[PDB]
Design a protein around this ligand. Structure first.
Ligand SMILES: CCCCCCCCCCCCCCCCCC(=O)OC[C@H](COP(=O)([O-])OCC(O)COP(=O)([O-])OC[C@@H](COC(=O)CCCCCCCCCCCCCCCCC)OC(=O)CCCCCCCCCCCCCCCCC)OC(=O)CCCCCCCCCCCCCCCCC
Ligand code: HEA
Ligand code: HEA
Ligand SMILES: CCCCCCCCCCCCCCCC(=O)OC[C@H](COP(=O)([O-])OCC[N+](C)(C)C)OC(=O)CCCCCCCCCCCCCCC
Ligand SMILES: CCCCCCCCCCCCCCCC(=O)OC[C@H](COP(=O)(O)OCCN)OC(=O)CCCCCCCCCCCCCCC
Ligand SMILES: CCCCCCCCCCCCCCCC(=O)OC[C@H](COP(=O)(O)OCCN)OC(=O)CCCCCCCCCCCCCCC
Ligand SMILES: CCCCCCCCCCCCCCCC(=O)OC[C@H](COP(=O)(O)OCCN)OC(=O)CCCCCCCCCCCCCCC
Ligand SMILES: CCCCCCCCCCCCCCCC(=O)OC[C@H](COP(=O)(O)OCCN)OC(=O)CCCCCCCCCCCCCCC
Ligand SMILES: CCCCCCCCCCCCCCCC(=O)OC[C@H](COP(=O)(O)OCCN)OC(=O)CCCCCCCCCCCCCCC
Ligand SMILES: CCCCCCCCCCCCCCCC(=O)OC[C@H](COP(=O)(O)OCCN)OC(=O)CCCCCCCCCCCCCCC
Ligand code: CUA
Ligand SMILES: [Cu+2]
Ligand SMILES: [Mg+2]
Lengths: 534, 45, 51, 269, 236, 104, 59, 67, 55
């Protein structure tokens, strides 16, 4: 069993391990979100008495852990590693040791990130780890060096997975997959793996410049000595916007597939949707400085960037319009991944509208480093990527794990996370437009109500994850009994109207991709022979 | 259509009760800050 | 060697044939996952102030 | 042929790799390297002995990985034409990622150069720093890369042709040519008026040229491995993907050196 | 000026720039609420009339007419949204002929204000470091964590342009009432303008991370009339 | 063909597609592909569908035609003026409806 | 020295794994296992000395 | 099927009550003392000072928020 | 005797997007006129009274 889980150059048994580190790190990151929002519940020094450096350490831990160790593994690494060979008919991926070392250099980035928060009080900068806040004069210690070595390791993991994905869907397709016949999640993982190797080299260059002007006495951003800290803002956000487009594009793919298969309708114009997604990918590099409208750019380049971020906004709009068009006229079977897919549309349209409220370089002077921004990204990142993650798990894990979950517990988990996460991030907009800045331990006690309402909501959003943990346990020890004893839903695609039950038992699964034709838990050599297509 | 109750009436009957429940679900999906402000001591409760 | 396939031979957890209940391992995994920021908070609150 | 001796094979051209213990070991070594070089930069451990052995164990694990891949590629014989096109496109995308690191370094140079700060004297190069003139030693180690490219391309086209005494002579003289390049580059470093700490000019100049320096010493190690397995008859006349890989790498290294050399030695002085 | 409990709107107007920002945000929200209402109405109508639909129109997969209208409608709305923000962005940088200048240089966890237009006829520039009152020496009516023992004081009805910088970590000079927010990076001076249209206090906070003392770093700007400001500047 | 289909081409194509079916899967398949279009089919289509369900000799797909049609139509005046056009085919073929078969 | 087909005839015809299949592959992996175990277990005894904050004894 | 919409709304409201109670008894152990400017007696002085200098003149300026 | 009944989803969606336009329009129209003209009229009343009180 050591050669099946430690050496293990097989893309099915790497994705399970990706998912295990994903659920582990997501638990750690939401423990940090619970501690943050538990300390910010009331003015005056709460549970952590004084000690604002500990709060800075906790918020950079929450941000960077839950971004680079939950969302990026459980969307790129886990789901791409399990499904990208299993949708295009490759037996499994090309460069298999490369996506084994990508997984196995993830948790060492995790353990050095964990031990970075213990030595010499700690790295507190936020996830956008800035100079001269992080240079050796204003921040001494080996903490932020381990904190950015974690980013070096996660950066290396995601690039190796990107090269792996790109070559394994550019060469090892099956017999009939043409250049435009792939299912849309394959196209999302394709374009995301391009944006990774087109973006994160610039990130790793900038943060190793930060490391060797911390410790090797150079002067990239040490300003008394020639440099400037604006160059780090450029070199960071040139990755920082493609990073979240990387984090959200497989979400678009997952949501496209689940609304295609739970409404008994193909997606409305798949070719225009993949053109919109590819243009979003190749356009997301040209708007990198919409996070830098304040620092002192000219009004002319600010005018250019506030022109270009709205043309960023339009193809996401035509994607959401195509989603409304492909759920219109269907036969919508409201199961638990379809509920997450329906909630994702509203809860991401809301965040995108407040995002284009932010995108005006005129209007960003009233909203920068302000809880309005937190209300925007904790919509489009949290609700977006993780409602797509839940609509990935609750839709795919009966096929992958081979154990059917409980259904009513899944629906109370959806409604609990929906209510208890809509009550958190909605008062953040009122805190933003009333004037609350970011990263404060706590605040002048005027706006003392909305923080309390958000803190009474975060406990609901944590209790729903505890119920998700119990859903995992009830799936793992009562899978076959939930197959038999009528607690679950068994057929995700219902029989059509004029079709008999004796005729539905002939053609059981009416899929459009390969994945729901493989047996529950699939064979380790699934495609012995190629899977033909016309 | 041609013969039957007219399409204006038979789709108004379908959609006019839907507008009020849409307004209810939107007024309680965006209007609960009013309900939490209504009971607090800032409104001289 | 093709490793043999089943319903419980796809995951690293052994579930059916054990000596201890599965709830021990399955909830201790997320116990240590949920308690790593608490031990970070404790080691940071004994280094500066009190606790 | 018979079905009975057709179903005794792979049934698809792609590679099925047996479980190998060289992601886990080199990932262990990468973790130990990262933590030990984060730990010795602040005086927690006494010497650089431990970062030395961590770098050494990373190097020897990765060379054992490349030993496993040359044994699997030419002894067990799995690299058919589909897998060959796959690893070729993978190396192309990896080098496309390397040139973007070089583009980030050029962005740093351009941003601090064409808008010079008021503490540099508002002139690029800054006051007092005697810049390196581009015509003495930079001209030799920018013509030596073109000569290296010419001899590695005739060694390639002699390897495809069939002669051994020419295809080996070109590889030997391109190895000694670029190691002469590396040695005169170190000669350029060890007598220069500015260090890596002397201002932002020395910082970004030494960052760019040192990254290209490390890239071509890795190229020299790659070409030494390729010359060894050309002498030991591994390289064929139509299955040399591990040599087309390194000639693609050295030609793109030549063109990124000329970009770096022009805007680091002519425009920037 | 000051924040209020359970508020859900802007700290109100003082400057023409903040009035323009408020009008622009209400125009943008007026154009956004149509889109939010029709998106929510489409989602509600679809998921409550096609859930009880037994058959699915699976032979509707493209139509060019409605496709190009829903891709040309957001371009139209985004052009109408971007049409006045260009006017605001190109007028909020117009700092032709200000009256007096301030420097607002921000150190580690305090600010240091200085006036050096030479009408103080003691001769010198005038500076003051502007520490926060620590939250046990508050005395029966003083706003917590955003009060200051030594306020900056500006005049009414004169254009004032102040530059800002730091001597350390990147700070931000940020008042939401005056609509002024500009990152004080330690390398460059950054100037912004103001025309305060009424007397009174205006509060703000640092809105970039400084480290430990990020919360204990406020901005307090009292705006007084011009003869009282001349008297204060001559006396101080 | 992504070009549109007029009503006469629709009814001729589907009459020649209901004539050719021989199994039960084929009759239910072409019935689903006829009903899941946008229009409701004229009774020249559906009396041929009733004959094609009679040829395979099974009853309930000659009843679910009528219930799928009741879900198709826009009111019940169209349904009644429809059902008195398929009266005698329903008589001599002997199929029932739903509301008289399951009174609730 | 044209010793590729003898190595191929050896490498195809064995049961041992690939990184142990060569004749001289005992001199390449035993000292590697020793120095790798040493080099990766050794910073995990210096990490609690760093958590406690006690630096080195240098100079 | 068969009244499970009732079971799931019972589970949702039970989860809201459970999270409310656990937030309450986690809130109970936080910190004994308040910042001294939290009760209403300080707030009346702190907005008398505001109406002395007519801050927020048309919008809301009164700060009490305490019982 | 029966007419061909065709085109119900087209009539339904062009009846639905028009009501979606007008519904979002009346919500946003209430927003702009009611709330924003309330704030603007309060502000202009205060500024007129201030410029009168400073005579
Ligand atoms: C303190 C009060 C604790 C109980 C709460 C009140 C209550 O009984 O509600 C149950 C009540 C229905 O109880 P029931 O139908 O009599 O019990 C079901 C059958 O008896 C079938 O129930 P059963 O006999 O299989 O259940 C065994 C019992 C076993 O309970 C015990 O062993 C005793 C200890 C129970 C407290 C711990 O487990 C419980 O009943 C847990 C109750 C919580 O549920 C509701 O009122 C609606 C759910 C809550 C809505 C949201 C409220 C906010
Ligand atoms: C991945 C992105 C992400 C997500 C999901 C969240 C979600 C949460 N965050 Fe936030 N946060 C950030 C990234 C994120 N955050 C970033 C980047 C910053 C900026 C930091 C800075 O600039 O300094 C920030 C800042 C930030 C603030 C603002 C503080 C400040 O800067 O002043 C707060 C306060 O409430 C907060 C707490 C929370 C809480 C309570 C949640 C809760 O929603 C958590 C509950 C979430 C879940 C329950 C999701 C389910 C979890 C699973 C593990 C599911 C497993 C399923 C699969 C694997 C399929 N974080
Ligand atoms: C997941 C990654 C992600 C995604 C997808 C987005 C989506 C968008 N974001 Fe966001 N954003 C962040 C990640 C992301 N953001 C992060 C991490 C921060 C904080 C960084 C920090 O620490 O400072 C941030 C904050 C942030 C800023 C920085 C402000 C500041 O810090 O000062 C800006 C600036 O322009 C912005 C704008 C937008 C816009 C216009 C979109 C658009 O892409 C949204 C597109 C969606 C829609 C437009 C809605 C759907 C469309 C329709 C319904 C059609 C009709 C719509 C129109 C006609 C407009 N958001
Ligand atoms: C079984 C458990 C039942 C509850 C046990 C008692 C819980 C409780 O007493 O909670 C107290 C809080 C008061 O919260 P507070 O006013 O912020 O006081 C904080 C406490 N200090 C730090 C000052 C010591 O009270 C609360 O916060 C209650 C939550 C807010 C009101 C609930 C809203 C939910 C809908 C009903
Ligand atoms: C740093 C990132 C280095 C990436 C190199 C990409 C090479 C592309 C390629 O051709 O990879 C080919 C091989 C992996 O291929 P494999 O054995 O899985 O192939 C099976 C046959 N198809 O070499 C590698 O990648 C090894 C790269 C890591 C070496 C240690 C680096 C430590 C840092
Ligand atoms: C807001 C509500 C907050 C309070 C919720 C408390 C628990 C309620 C339980 C409800 C329940 O139990 O729903 C169960 C019923 C199922 O009925 P059925 O049609 O299958 O019946 C068939 C009988 N044989 O509803 C539904 O799934 C349909 C409604 C789906 C709702 C999806 C919501 C997605 C997020 C919002 C998206 C935008 C919509 C809002 C804006 C227009
Ligand atoms: C959506 C469903 C979940 C919403 C939960 C919101 C509760 C927020 C809260 O906790 O409300 C806090 C308020 C303000 O109380 P306070 O600041 O005066 O108390 C100072 C410290 N106790 O208390 C109430 O109004 C109690 C009545 C709650 C009514 C909720 C109505 C929801 C609609
Ligand atoms: C992954 C990230 C990849 C991106 C890398 C970005 C650039 C980093 C390498 C620049 C080399 C600079 C140089 O070679 O500098 C040469 C200088 C010596 O010059 P001198 O001052 O003695 O000159 C004297 C003139 N008379 O060495 C130094 O003092 C600093 C050395 C630091 C350690 C090496 C670099 C560490 C990071 C390497 C990462 C490789 C991967
Ligand atoms: C750090 C030290 C770097 C040393 C590099 C050694 C390269 C030799 C690899 C080799 O020799 O790989 C031989 C193989 C196949 O050979 P073939 O099929 O052409 O032979 C067939 C004869 N009939 O090439 C490859 O798969 C590509 C290998 C690319 C590896 C790039 C690694 C870059 C690491 C950067 C960090
Ligand atoms: C869209 C959501 C609209 C509903 C919001 C409900 C707020 C209820 C409440 O909490 O309103 C409470 C406040 C009370 O504050 P006060 O000034 O009386 O304080 C004085 C305390 N002594 O009412 C108002 O100020 C205005 C009335 C409500 C205005 C609605 C919000 C207008 C701005 C929109 C902000 C949202 C931006 C979202 C960006 C995508
Ligand atoms: Cu200065 Cu925050
Ligand atoms: Cu961005
Ligand atoms: Mg900022």
């Amino acid at each position: 069993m050591v050669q099946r889980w430690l050496y293990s150059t097989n893309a099915k048994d790497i994705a399970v391990l990706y998912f295990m580190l994903a659920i582990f790190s997501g638990m750690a990151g939401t423990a940090m979100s619970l501690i943050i929002r538990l300390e910010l519940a009331a003015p005056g020094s709460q549970y952590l008495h004084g000690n604002s450096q500990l709060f800075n350490v906790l918020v950079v831990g929450h941000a960077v852990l839950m971004i680079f160790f939950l969302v990026m593994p459980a969307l790129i690494g886990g789901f791409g590693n399990y499904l990208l060979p299993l949708m295009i008919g490759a037996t499994d991926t090309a460069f298999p040791r490369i996506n084994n070392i990508a997984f196995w250099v993830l948790p060492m980035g995790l353990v050095c990130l964990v031990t970075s928060t213990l030595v010499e009080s700690g790295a507190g900068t936020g996830w956008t780890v800035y100079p001269p806040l992080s240079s050796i004069q204003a921040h001494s210690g080996p903490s932020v060096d381990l904190a950015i070595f974690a980013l070096h390791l996660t950066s290396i993991s995601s690039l190796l997975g990107a090269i792996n994905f790109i070559v394994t869907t550019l060469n090892m397709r099956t017999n009939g997959m043409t250049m435009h016949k792939l299912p849309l999640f394959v196209w999302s993982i394709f374009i995301t793996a391009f944006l990774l190797l087109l973006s994160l080299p610039v990130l790793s260059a900038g943060i190793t410049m930060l490391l060797l002007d911390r410790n090797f006495n150079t002067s990239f951003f040490e300003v008394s000595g020639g440099g400037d800290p604006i160059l780090y803002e450029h070199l960071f956000w040139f990755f920082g916007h493609p990073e979240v487009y990387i984090l959200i594009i497989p979400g678009f793919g997952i949501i496209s597939h689940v609304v295609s298969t739970y409404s008994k309708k193909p997606v409305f114009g798949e070719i225009s949707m993949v053109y919109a997604m590819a243009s979003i990918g190749l356009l997301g590099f040209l708007v990198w400085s919409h996070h830098m409208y304040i620092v002192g750019l000219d009004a002319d380049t600010r005018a250019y960037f506030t022109s270009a971020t709205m043309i960023i906004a339009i193809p996401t709009g035509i994607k959401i319009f195509s989603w409304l068009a492909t759920i219109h006229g269907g036969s919508i079977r409201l199961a638990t991944p379809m509920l997450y897919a329906i909630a994702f549309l509203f809860l991401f349209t809301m965040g995108g509208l407040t995002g284009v409220a932010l995108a005006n370089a005129s209007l960003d002077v009233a909203f920068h480093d302000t809880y309005y921004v937190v209300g925007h990204f904790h919509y489009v990142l949290s609700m977006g990527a993780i409602f797509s993650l839940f609509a990935g798990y609750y839709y795919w894990s009966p096929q992958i794990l081979g154990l059917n979950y409980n259904e009513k517990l899944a629906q109370i988990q959806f409604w609990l996370i929906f209510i208890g996460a809509n009550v958190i991030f909605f008062p953040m907009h009122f805190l933003g437009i009333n004037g609350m800045p970011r990263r404060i331990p706590d605040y002048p006690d005027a706006f003392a109500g909305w923080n309390y309402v958000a803190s009474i909501g975060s406990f609901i959003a944590t209790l729903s994850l505890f119920l998700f943990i119990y859903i995992l346990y009830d799936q793992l020890v009562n899978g076959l009994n939930n197959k038999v004893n009528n607690k679950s839903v068994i057929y995700n695609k219902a029989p059509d109207f004029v079709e008999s039950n004796t005729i539905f038992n002939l053609n059981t699964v009416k899929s459009s991709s390969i994945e729901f034709l493989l047996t529950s838990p699939p064979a380790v050599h699934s495609f012995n022979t190629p899977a033909v297509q016309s | 259509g041609r013969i039957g109750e007219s399409w204006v009436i038979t789709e108004g009957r379908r959609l006019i009760p839907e507008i009020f429940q849409w307004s209810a679900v939107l007024s309680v999906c965006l209007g609960w800050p009013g309900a939490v402000y209504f009971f607090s001591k800032a409104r001289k409760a | 060697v093709h490793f043999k396939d089943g319903v419980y031979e796809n995951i690293p957890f052994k579930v059916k044939g054990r000596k201890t209940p599965y709830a021990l391992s399955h909830f201790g995994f997320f116990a240590i996952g949920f308690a790593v920021p608490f031990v970070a908070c404790y080691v940071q609150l004994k280094k500066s102030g009190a606790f | 042929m018979t079905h009975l001796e057709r179903s005794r094979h792979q049934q698809h051209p792609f590679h099925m790799v047996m479980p190998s213990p060289w992601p886990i070991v080199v990932s262990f070594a990468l973790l130990s390297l990262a933590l030990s070089t984060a730990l010795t930069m602040h005086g927690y451990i006494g010497n650089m002995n431990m970062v030395y052995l961590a770098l050494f164990v990373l190097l020897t694990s990765s060379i054992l990985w490349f030993r496993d891949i040359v044994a699997e590629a030419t002894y067990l014989g799995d690299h058919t034409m589909a897998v060959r096109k796959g690893i070729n496109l993978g190396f192309l995308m990896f080098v496309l990622s390397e040139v973007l690191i070089f583009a980030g370094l050029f962005w740093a140079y351009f941003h601090s150069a064409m808008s010079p700060d008021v503490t540099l004297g508002a002139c690029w190069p800054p006051v007092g720093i005697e810049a390196v003139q581009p015509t003495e030693l930079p001209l030799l180690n920018t013509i030596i890369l073109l000569s290296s490219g010419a001899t590695v391309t005739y060694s390639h086209h002699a390897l495809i042709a069939g002669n051994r005494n020419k295809a080996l002579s070109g590889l030997l003289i391109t190895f000694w040519l670029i190691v002469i390049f590396v040695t005169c580059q170190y000669i350029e470093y060890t007598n220069a008026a500015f260090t890596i700490s002397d201002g932002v000019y020395g910082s970004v100049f030494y960052a760019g040229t040192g990254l290209h320096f490390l890239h071509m010493v890795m190229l020299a190690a790659m070409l030494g491995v390729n010359y060894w397995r050309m002498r030991n008859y591994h390289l064929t006349a139509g299955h040399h993907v591990g040599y087309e890989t390194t000639i693609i790498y050295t030609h793109v290294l030549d063109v990124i050196w000329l970009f770096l050399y022009v805007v680091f030695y002519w425009w920037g002085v | 000026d000051v924040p209020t409990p359970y508020a859900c709107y802007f700290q109100d107007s003082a400057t023409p720039n903040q009035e323009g920002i408020l009008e622009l945000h209400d125009n943008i929200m007026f154009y956004l609420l149509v889109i939010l209402g029709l998106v929510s109405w489409m989602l509600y109508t679809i998921v409550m009339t096609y859930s009880k639909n037994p058959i699915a129109y699976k032979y509707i997969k493209h139509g060019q007419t409605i496709e190009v209208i829903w891709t040309i409608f957001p371009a139209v709305i985004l052009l109408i949204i971007a049409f006045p923000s260009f006017i605001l962005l190109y007028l909020c940088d117009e700092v032709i002929s200000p009256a007096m200048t301030i420097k607002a240089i921000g150190y580690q966890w305090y600010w240091k204000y200085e006036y050096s237009d030479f009408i103080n006829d003691s001769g010198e520039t005038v500076e003051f470091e502007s520490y926060v009152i620590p939250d046990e020496l508050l005395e029966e009516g003083q706003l917590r964590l955003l009060d200051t023992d030594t306020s900056m004081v500006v005049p009414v009805d004169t254009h004032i342009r102040f530059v800002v910088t730091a001597a350390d970590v990147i700070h931000d000079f940020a008042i939401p009432s005056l609509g002024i927010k500009v990152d004080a990076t330690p390398g460059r001076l950054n100037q912004v303008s103001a025309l305060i249209q009424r007397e009174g206090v205006f509060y703000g906070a640092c809105s970039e991370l400084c480290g430990t003392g990020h919360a204990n770093m406020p901005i307090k700007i009292e705006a007084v009339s011009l003869p009282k400001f001349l008297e204060w500047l001559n006396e101080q | 063909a992504h070009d549109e289909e007029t009503f006469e081409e629709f009814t001729a194509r589907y009459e020649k597609e209901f004539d050719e079916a021989y199994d039960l899967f084929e009759v239910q398949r072409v019935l689903n592909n006829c009903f899941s279009y946008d229009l409701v089919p004229a009774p020249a289509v559906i009396e041929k569908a009733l004959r094609a369900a009679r040829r395979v000799n099974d009853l309930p797909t000659a009843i679910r035609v009528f219930e799928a049609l009741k879900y198709k139509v826009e009111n019940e005046d169209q349904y009644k003026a429809y059902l008195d056009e398929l009266k005698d085919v329903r008589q001599e073929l002997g199929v029932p409806l739903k509301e008289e078969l399951f009174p609730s | 020295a044209n010793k590729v087909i003898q190595l191929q005839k050896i490498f195809q015809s064995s049961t041992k794994p690939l990184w142990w299949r060569h004749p001289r592959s005992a001199l390449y992996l035993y000292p590697f296992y020793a120095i790798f175990a040493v080099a990766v277990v050794t910073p995990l005894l210096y990490i609690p000395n760093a958590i406690r904050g006690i630096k080195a004894k240098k100079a | 099927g068969k009244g499970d919409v009732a079971f799931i709304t019972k589970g949702v409201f039970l989860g809201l009550g459970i999270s409310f109670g656990l937030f309450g008894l986690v809130r109970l152990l936080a910190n004994p003392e308040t910042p001294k400017t939290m009760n209403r007696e300080w707030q009346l002085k702190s907005d008398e000072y505001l109406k002395s200098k007519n801050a927020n003149p048309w919008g809301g300026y009164s700060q009490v928020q305490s019982k | 005797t029966i007419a061909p009944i065709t085109g119900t989803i087209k009539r339904r969606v062009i009846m639905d997007i028009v009501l979606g336009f007008s519904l979002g329009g009346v919500m946003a129209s209430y927003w702009w006129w009611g709330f924003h003209m309330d704030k603007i009229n309060k502000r202009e009343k205060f500024y007129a009274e201030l410029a009168e009180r400073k005579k």
